[PDB]
Design an enzyme around this catalytic site. Structure first.
Site, PDB file in Angstrom:
ATOM      1  N   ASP A  16       0.873  -1.262  -0.038  1.00 35.82           N
ATOM      2  CA  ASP A  16       0.067   0.079   0.033  1.00 35.82           C
ATOM      3  C   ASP A  16       1.029   1.212   0.012  1.00 35.82           C
ATOM      4  O   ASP A  16       0.576   2.312   0.881  1.00 35.82           O
ATOM      5  CB  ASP A  16      -0.805  -0.015   1.154  1.00 35.82           C
ATOM      6  N   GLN A  25       1.642   9.421   1.241  1.00 36.36           N
ATOM      7  CA  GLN A  25       1.572   9.990   2.840  1.00 36.36           C
ATOM      8  C   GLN A  25       2.274   8.961   3.678  1.00 36.36           C
ATOM      9  O   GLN A  25       2.586   8.991   4.750  1.00 36.36           O
ATOM     10  CB  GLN A  25      -0.033   9.700   3.159  1.00 36.36           C
TER      11      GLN A  25
HETATM   12 BR1  LIG Z   1       5.456   5.534  11.488  1.00 41.54          BR
HETATM   13  C1  LIG Z   1       5.577   7.390  11.296  1.00 41.54           C
HETATM   14  C2  LIG Z   1       6.859   8.119  11.759  1.00 41.54           C
HETATM   15  N1  LIG Z   1       6.384   9.440  11.378  1.00 41.54           N
HETATM   16  C3  LIG Z   1       5.387   9.410  10.714  1.00 41.54           C
HETATM   17  C4  LIG Z   1       4.618  10.582  10.189  1.00 41.54           C
HETATM   18  N2  LIG Z   1       5.315  11.773  10.452  1.00 41.54           N
HETATM   19  C5  LIG Z   1       4.946  12.788   9.209  1.00 41.54           C
HETATM   20  C6  LIG Z   1       3.980  13.623   9.920  1.00 41.54           C
HETATM   21  C7  LIG Z   1       4.455  14.529  11.022  1.00 41.54           C
HETATM   22  N3  LIG Z   1       3.739  15.475  11.906  1.00 41.54           N
HETATM   23  C8  LIG Z   1       2.593  15.429  11.376  1.00 41.54           C
HETATM   24  N4  LIG Z   1       1.937  14.993  10.285  1.00 41.54           N
HETATM   25  C9  LIG Z   1       2.594  14.134   9.458  1.00 41.54           C
HETATM   26  C10 LIG Z   1       3.544  10.281   9.610  1.00 41.54           C
HETATM   27  C11 LIG Z   1       2.846   8.928   9.399  1.00 41.54           C
HETATM   28  C12 LIG Z   1       1.609   8.658   8.700  1.00 41.54           C
HETATM   29  C13 LIG Z   1       0.459   9.411   8.657  1.00 41.54           C
HETATM   30  C14 LIG Z   1      -0.401   9.390   7.738  1.00 41.54           C
HETATM   31  C15 LIG Z   1      -0.823   7.975   7.027  1.00 41.54           C
HETATM   32  C16 LIG Z   1       0.544   7.175   7.343  1.00 41.54           C
HETATM   33  C17 LIG Z   1       1.463   7.246   7.983  1.00 41.54           C
HETATM   34  C18 LIG Z   1       3.591   7.980   9.952  1.00 41.54           C
HETATM   35  N5  LIG Z   1       5.012   8.272  10.619  1.00 41.54           N
END
Ligand SMILES: Brc1cnc2c(NCc3cncnc3)cc(-c3ccccc3)cn12
EC number: 2.7.11.22
Length: 276
Positions: free
Chosen positions: A120, A124
């Site tokens: 997937d 994002q």
């Molecule tokens: Br594990 C992981 C470690 N850091 C993130 C991350 N950081 C980006 C972010 C930081 N601060 C605010 N918003 C985004 C987003 C997602 C994620 C988010 C949505 C869908 C899938 C993965 C998973 N993450």
């Protein structure tokens, strides 16, 4: 879970919500995923903990308590979707697109060598940092825009090739600043792919007509030239993309082979300008 102080929700994963949190003890800032327990899931997840690579988000800890499951991951500040939106006016510089593609292919090559699939991939879940790195998030845990045609046609035993397809879609999107195949239903996704790449047949994809969801009644569209699809990408980039988007999963380029493609002869590692 009491060892963690939630700071903010950073999205809604496929299984549970993801939060930025602080390890009340270590002081560590992490991404906490609350899933959303089958013993098989526990064992499988535990193995992912040993799958460590520079371009894979580190799974730090697995917490099964109160019959609940939390996954503690290393935290990254931005994702590729946000970065692409932020870069929408000028577009991401080619050298940075190339660096990111190269790193993601290294990540996939690693996972695939360990028989682990993502399934997937989408912007994002590609996470970036200030040092010019990019990492795959959610590998092994398993929008239609990035789904491979064999999945849409009902193939139950799909392969590592689905990740190459998703990544080729993302590569195109970084280049053009538009999603390649922004479908809003499974059939619309399939037909968008057919309109661009031509309706697949037994010549280009042996066995396609016998697949579970294939219908003889599908419209027959002719294929478009990549020069129209991803201008102004150069011939090396278009040739690589075409290979990553081959219909037949057995013909689609592997991550390992893609790393050797001429497109990467001049790859470098630029630093992105990130506003956090
Ligand atoms: Br594990 C992981 C470690 N850091 C993130 C991350 N950081 C980006 C972010 C930081 N601060 C605010 N918003 C985004 C987003 C997602 C994620 C988010 C949505 C869908 C899938 C993965 C998973 N993450």
């Amino acid at each position: 879970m009491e060892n963690f102080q939630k700071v903010e929700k950073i999205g809604e994963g496929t299984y549970g919500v993801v939060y930025k949190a602080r390890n009340k003890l270590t002081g560590e800032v992490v991404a906490l995923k609350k899933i959303r327990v089958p013993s098989t899931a526990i064992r499988e997840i535990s193995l992912l903990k040993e799958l460590n690579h520079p371009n894979i988000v580190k799974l730090l800890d697995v917490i099964h308590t109160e019959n609940k499951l939390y996954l503690v991951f290393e935290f990254l500040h931005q994702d590729l979707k946000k970065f692409m939106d932020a870069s929408a006016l000028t577009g991401i510089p080619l050298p940075l697109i190339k660096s990111y593609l190269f790193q993601l292919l290294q990540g996939l090559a690693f996972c695939h060598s360990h028989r682990v699939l993502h399934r997937d991939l989408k912007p994002q879940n590609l996470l970036i940092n200030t040092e010019g790195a990019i990492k795959l998030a959610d590998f092994g845990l398993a929008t239609l825009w990035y789904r491979a045609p064999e999945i849409l046609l009902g193939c139950k035993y799909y392969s590592t090739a689905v990740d190459i397809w998703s990544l080729g879609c993302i590569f195109a999107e970084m280049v053009t600043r538009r999603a390649l195949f922004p479908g809003d239903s499974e059939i619309d996704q399939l037909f968008r792919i057919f309109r661009t790449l031509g309706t697949p047949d037994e010549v280009v994809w042996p066995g396609v007509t016998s697949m579970p969801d294939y219908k003889p009644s599908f419209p027959k569209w002719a294929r478009q030239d990549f020069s129209k699809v991803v201008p102004p990408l150069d011939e090396d980039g278009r040739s690589l993309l075409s290979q990553m988007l081959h219909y037949d999963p057995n013909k689609r380029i592997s991550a390992k082979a893609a790393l050797a493609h001429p497109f990467f002869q001049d790859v470098t590692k630029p630093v992105p300008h990130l506003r956090l």
